[PDB]
Amino acid sequence: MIEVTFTPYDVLLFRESRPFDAGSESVARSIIPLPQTVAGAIRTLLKGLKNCVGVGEEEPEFTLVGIAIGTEKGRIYPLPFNIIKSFYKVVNPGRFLGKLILPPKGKYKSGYVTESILEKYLKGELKEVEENKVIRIEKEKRIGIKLMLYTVEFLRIEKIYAWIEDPGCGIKDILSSYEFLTLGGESRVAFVEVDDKTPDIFNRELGSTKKALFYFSTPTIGKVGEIVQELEKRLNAKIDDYLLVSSRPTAISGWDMHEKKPKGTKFAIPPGSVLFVEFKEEVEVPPYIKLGKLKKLGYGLALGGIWE
Amino acid sequence: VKDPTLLRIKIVPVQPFIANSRKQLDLWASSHLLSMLMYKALEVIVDKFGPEHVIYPSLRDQPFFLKFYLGENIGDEILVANLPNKALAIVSGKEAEKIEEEIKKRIRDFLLQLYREAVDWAVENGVVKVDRSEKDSMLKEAYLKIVREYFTVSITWVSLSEKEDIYQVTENAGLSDEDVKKWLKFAEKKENSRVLERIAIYPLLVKILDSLGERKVTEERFEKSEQLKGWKCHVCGENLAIFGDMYDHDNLKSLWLDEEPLCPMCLIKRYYPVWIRSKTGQKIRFESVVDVALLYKNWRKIFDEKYGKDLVSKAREVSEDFVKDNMLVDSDLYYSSTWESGDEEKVKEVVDFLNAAYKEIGNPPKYYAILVMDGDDMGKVISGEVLYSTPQVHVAISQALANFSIREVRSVVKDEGLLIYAGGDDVLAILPVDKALEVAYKIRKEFGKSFELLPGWKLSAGILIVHYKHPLYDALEKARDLLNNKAKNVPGKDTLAIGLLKRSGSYYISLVGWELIRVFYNSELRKKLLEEGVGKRFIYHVLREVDTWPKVGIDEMLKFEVIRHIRGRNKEETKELREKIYGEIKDLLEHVRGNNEVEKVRGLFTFLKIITDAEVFP
Ligand SMILES: Nc1ncnc2c1ncn2[C@@H]1O[C@H](COP(=O)(O)OP(=O)(O)OP(=O)(O)O)[C@@H](O)[C@H]1O
Ligand SMILES: Nc1ncnc2c1ncn2[C@@H]1O[C@H](COP(=O)(O)OP(=O)(O)OP(=O)(O)O)[C@@H](O)[C@H]1O
Ligand SMILES: [Mg+2]
Ligand SMILES: [Mg+2]
Ligand SMILES: [Zn+2]
Incomplete structure (x- = not known):
């Protein structure tokens, strides 16, 4: 199983012919060139990879085991739905009429948690989580133009992790030959890092x-x-x-x-x-x-x- | 009732359905239809056991009940949605299973019925410009399936007469505490035994049934099937739009009024208003949020009394489609900017005309408010009160709540805005910005009179102020968020969270206690800000003084700032005014939420920044 790490960046399409520079000067904008940079789109690799993506087929030959997001604190996950807010308490199943039920103990308040905390949770060692341990992700605001103005919002994220099971498409080699890849249906590009190992959370x-x-x-x-x-x-x-x-x-x-x-x-x-x-x-x-x-x-x- | 059995009804989804709306009319339709679904479900229980067997909500004075069952001639009050999406009733054990299946059926058939009526209405009105055979494809299984599976009506029940070891039943249900074990003790006292009848612990039984019920609801709401591939509904973007699997995006759009393809659920939504009109001869006074916005300072009335005639004239002139019944088709034609983007020279007259009117009467209100109110800790406060006599006190509580929602909430709103839903302790209303605060205050006050320094019955609320062009879906999300994550997040709740979302994207939020509204309204500070940009810089400077703790301390900084910005006509007046403003600021600080004095000043001055915004409060 390979681990692909994406570092997303938004693309700013600039023109050398602009009206007022006072604007970008007040913002102290700097445009430094990036020599020897290997870019490319997932809409082009999907470069021989045609042999692993069926034409007209819903799923590919390889399997995307999953995707997880990460911030400066590393990989994070949605707070388990049975952790209720008061301090956040872990509530396990009770019983009634021979049926498993969730005892009422308050409303669930959404948030994220680090892999570290989720790990303690999965082992049944977590009784509660201090509120300062629960993460809230700020929404990013963008004006979208389809290719009518749109309002595009999404989580403020630093990393995107993709776990892939490759039966023989040579995905690790393709990806490893690229530093940057533009995402699908977005003016976003991302740096690509590929590790040939399976993550702890799975072992x-x-x-x-x-x-x-x-x-x-x-x-x-x-x-x-x-x-x-x-x-x-x-x-x-x-x-x-x-x-x-x-x-x-x-x-x-x-x-x-x-x-x-x-x-x-x-x-x-x-x-x-x-x-x-x-x-x-x-x-x-x-x-x-x-x-x-x-x-x-x-x-x-x-x-x-x-x-x- | 032979063998008494407690039964619970739950209908989902709610907020997600209401939010999938483009116009106020859709919003009201979603909410009203939801109440209608609950009513259909409850009539199944009334037919077999009568209203007295429905513990919550209280049917007794429910408009829907008076007009659709006991057949009376109630008026527009029928327009309000007063029935919540959850209910509790006592029925017969041997009948429960039939009732379950029976409720799922009447709700399913009713929806299919509205759908077919909606398809007929849609074709016969231009909503959808389609063939003669194509009209029959609108009724194929694919679309019928979406209607049948959208809502989940879940029912769970438990015998009130079966006996059980009270201690073990609550322990196993994860409900055993000291306070609960103590209550259980007094219970084992009355009846010299620990093995009692379920109704012996009624209060704790309601909580358990709620959990058993929730287990079932999540199991049933996930038993959905896939949909056909194709273009999705423009209103919700979730469900396949009718004819979305037969045409390309462009050809699909050309078949629909305003080029907005609808899915089965949103078609019912567009039809629901006329259906209600045909069923009751009633329709909401305000159909667009713009209609609610123009109520600000009677602008709408005033304008209509001194420019109403001509505008319609010049309108009809530019085109005959903008007019009808001697009045504009859409209320947004009251905005100059609408003509400039939505016979050129013939239009230049309208624009110049409106701009001219704004000179003498003032620019038209472009902001409106969404008010959401919701009882704090009702679950605990109710069971606490209830803690075969118990069920009766529960009915008493429910009747007190239905009475409040049906008569009292309705009384403060009057025709000052649109009251969409009021199901007991919860409220959803669209109000002009100059009434929002007072309306919410009165509802909170009345609530306090109906249920009585440290009150046990409280209401938290969210008031979102937005531009008339803001997507309703997002506005509802933010209003809910103000209620749930801001107001309800304050320790002790009983808070009003005020958000001002400017068209520019700037978002200002202030968390306050209810009395801030009273104290501010009667303040000299309020009068002085209104007759001043002195207010703007005073607010700017104070805020800048509290981005951090001011060296000289809050009091000293506030006195200094008051002195720098507050002045009268003579040393006499200005001294008393500075002393009065300073003291009112301190009284207001008492009612602003925040972990410390710096946060309170920030919240107060953010609130002031909000109600002194000329764009929103022209
Ligand atoms: N008919 C309605 N119109 C407007 N508001 C309603 C209506 N029915 C219920 N409400 C409000 O919506 C609240 C529930 O919202 P929500 O969307 O969370 O539904 P839910 O019953 O909690 O289902 P879910 O499990 O999907 O959350 C109710 O407690 C009440 O405050
Ligand atoms: N009169 C009543 N009798 C029994 N149950 C009621 C009654 N009124 C409301 N309820 C139930 O109490 C629920 C309270 O839901 P809500 O999500 O508002 O939780 P809460 O206990 O009010 O806490 P908070 O609102 O502070 O989060 C209502 O949604 C409804 O299911
Ligand atoms: Mg909910
Ligand atoms: Mg509540
Ligand atoms: Zn739809």
Whole structure:
């Protein structure tokens, strides 16, 4: 599994022919050239890579295991939906009428958490999180022009991590030959770094238990019952009960490049949701597992956890 | 009721559906339709057991109930959405499962019914310029499926008569504390036993049923199916637009009025207003946010009384499409700028005419306010009060809430703006900026009278002021955010979060206690700012003095600044005025939220910066 690290930058298209320089002078703008720089678009590599991206096919040959964002503090993740605000408290499943339920203890207040904290959470060692440990990401404001003015907002991010499973497309070699790549459908370019190793978060060892949990780190497409079904068959274990702690479905669209049309809308369990499972017999919880539809496009990344 | 069973109804989604709106009319339609769905669900329970068996909301005086069940002749009050998306009722155990399936069906059929009626209405009115056969494709499964699956009506129930070890039931449900174990003790006292009937711990049962109910709602709302590929709705951009799978973007747009393709849900939304009109002969007084904005200082009335006639004349002149019923089609034609971008020389008359009017009457209000109010800690405060007698006190609480929402909230809003929703302790209203503060204050005050220095029943609120051109979706998001993340985030809640979002993108937020509104309104400071740009620099200088702690201290800095900017007509007046303004600033500081004096001064002066903005309060 390779780890690709993107460092995004917005592109400013400047002209050598401008009216008033007093403007850019007051802002102290400096335009320094970047010699020997290798740029390129993902709309061009997708350069021989045609042999791994089906023409008119929805998914590629390789699998995008998942994507995570990072700030100056490193990689961060949506605060697990069962962590309620008061200090933030971790609330585990209770029971009633033989059914797993989430005891009422307050409203969930969204935010992010560092991999460090999520790691303690997945091991069931986290009881609460000091509010200064919970991250809030500032929204970036841009004026969008499609190619009518638009309002474009997105999270203030420093890094984007992509985990890729390459069956033999030579992706590591292609990417390694580039320093910069312009993203898809945006005037953004990014620096590219490629590491030939799999991340710690995926090599964890949770041991074996009957009370397991699965944190959805990327949107996971599928009806609850189906996901719980896929989980049983994948782990060859029976699930006597489960509880999905989530908010509401998020609409996933996508562009069908073959049809020159938008893809059919799909609904997904949003990142941050936690699936609490109670197996019949002990299971050795995997560090991570892919569930639902469009796995190869990055959806369905679930991180294994434990609860008591 | 044979075997008493507590039943809970939950309908989602709410805010996401309301936010998917382009005009005020859509906004009102989403909210009203939501209340309509709950009503359809409750009538299923009333038919079998009557209203007295519906604990919450209180049907007794619900307009919807009086007009659609007991068939009365209620008026425009029917326009308000008074039913929340959640309800609790006592029914018969053997009937519960039927009732569940029965509620899902009446809601499903009602929506399909509105959809087909909407398709007919749409084609017969130019909404969608389509073929004769193509009209039948609008009713195919793909579109029907979207209507059938958009809303989730979830029902869960529990027997009130079954016996259980009280301690173990609450412990296992993760509800056991000291305060709860203590209550459970007094319970085991009354009935010399610890194994009681579920209704014995009713207060804790409501909380547990809520959790059991929430488990089910998330399980059902995710049982959705995929949609056909194609261009999406222009209003929500989420669901496939009708004919979105048959045409390219350009040809799809040409088939729709205003070139805005709609999806099944947003079509129902556009039709809902006429449906209600045909059903009750009623329609909202203000249809656009612009209509609510022009209520500022009676500009709309004034202008209409001294320029209303001519404008329509010169309008009709430029074109006959801008006029109708001797009045403009859209209220935005009241803005010069609308003509310049939305027979040239024939238009130059309109522009010059309007600009001229603005000279004598003043520029037209372009900002309006969105008010959202919501009870603080209602869940705990209610169960606390309730802590077979309990259910009765719960009904009493609910009736007190329905009474407040139906009669009292309605009374302070009158026709000063548009009251869209009022479901008990919660409110959604669109108001002109010069009424927002007072309206919110009165609603908070009335709420306090209906439920009585350290009050137990409180309301927090968000008031967002925006330009009439601001996307409604974003405005609702920001109003909710002011309520949930700003006001409700203040320890002790009971706060009003005021946000001013200028067209330029600048965003000013002030967190205040309710009394700031009273104290400010009656202040000499308020009168002096209105007759001054002295106010602007005074506010600029104070704020600059509190980007950090001022060396000389807050009091000394405030006295100094007051002296530098406040003056009367003679030493006599100016001295008393400086002493009065200084003391009012200190009284106001008492009501601004903040972790310290620097933060309080900043919040107060940010608030002042907001209500003295000439663009918003011309
Ligand atoms: N018909 C309505 N019109 C306007 N506001 C409503 C209406 N119904 C309910 N509300 C308000 O919306 C609030 C719920 O908003 P929300 O979107 O969070 O729904 P929810 O029931 O919490 O479902 P979800 O699980 O999706 O959050 C209710 O508590 C009430 O304050
Ligand atoms: N009269 C009532 N009887 C029983 N339940 C009620 C009654 N009125 C409202 N409720 C329920 O209480 C819920 C409170 O929801 P909300 O999201 O406002 O939480 P809250 O307990 O009010 O806390 P806060 O608003 O401070 O976050 C309402 O959404 C509704 O589900
Ligand atoms: Mg909610
Ligand atoms: Mg509340
Ligand atoms: Zn739509």
